[PDB]
Symmetry: C2
Subunit: 150 residues, 2 copies
């Protein structure tokens, strides 16, 4: 059951206000207007949401996913895309996915980790993110939302 949705405008996307690299497009999401972030091309791919641990209930396992689509112009995905959750104490969940195998123009959710908040970690920043910083061109990824479920 989904507790929060965090749209890309709330994230920090490196080069996200440079129209050479990223565009933004308004779409309806249920009753709301959201803007999808549409990657044209970068070598430095980096998207990071930050939300406080106090936003969440303690002693409860949450899992987080990002909803994305590969465009008709998709290339450069044969590399590992890093998936990260960083907790208030600096500890991290870290995993990777290869998107090159995926079909375009279809929404799909990538799981980026699970966490539970106990003791010290029940307050302070939590980062949710994904990145690839290799010197190859990543093209044609549209980002819909971060979802946090429990």
């Amino acid at each position: 059951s989904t507790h929060y949705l965090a749209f890309p405008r709330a994230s920090t996307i490196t080069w996200g206000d440079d129209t050479r690299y990223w565009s933004w497009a308004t779409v309806d999401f249920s009753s709301y207007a959201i803007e999808e972030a549409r990657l044209l091309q970068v070598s430095w791919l980096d998207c990071r949401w930050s939300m406080d641990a106090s936003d969440f209930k303690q002693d409860i396992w949450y899992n987080a996913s990002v909803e994305v689509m590969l465009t008709s112009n998709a290339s450069g995905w044969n590399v590992p895309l890093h998936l990260e959750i960083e907790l208030p104490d600096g500890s991290k969940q870290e995993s990777q996915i290869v998107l090159a195998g995926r079909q375009p123009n279809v929404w799909f959710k990538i799981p980026i980790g699970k966490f539970i908040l106990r003791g010290s970690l029940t307050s302070g920043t939590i980062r949710f993110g994904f990145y690839n910083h290799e010197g190859n061109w990543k093209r044609g990824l549209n980002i819909r939302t971060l979802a946090i479920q429990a």
Copy 2:
């Protein structure tokens, strides 16, 4: 443009786990499963989301709204429903709406305030909420989501 959605499971609802007063129902919201909170009847109506100011961008006016519906069994709305945003420094936006005038079985958004985060208020808890604590029975309110736009 909507930056976050916060579903009721993330909120604190007084009597929200008592099945005499509230029920919960799973529904599809775009690609996600959410649970609407369905008020049967209470005298003490109180729903509060908490999210940190650091979740948001500074020097930017945000507005917040709650999406709700009145059921076929709706009564007790001829009173003022309090709408509140409490900022990290303890200051508040406070307003009120009378729902008795509203038609049931139709989703509608109630604006609960605007805020901007500058200086000290760019970190620390922000509460978003609504309440009525009068000794009359409030019946038949379903709650879909808190939305924060900018």
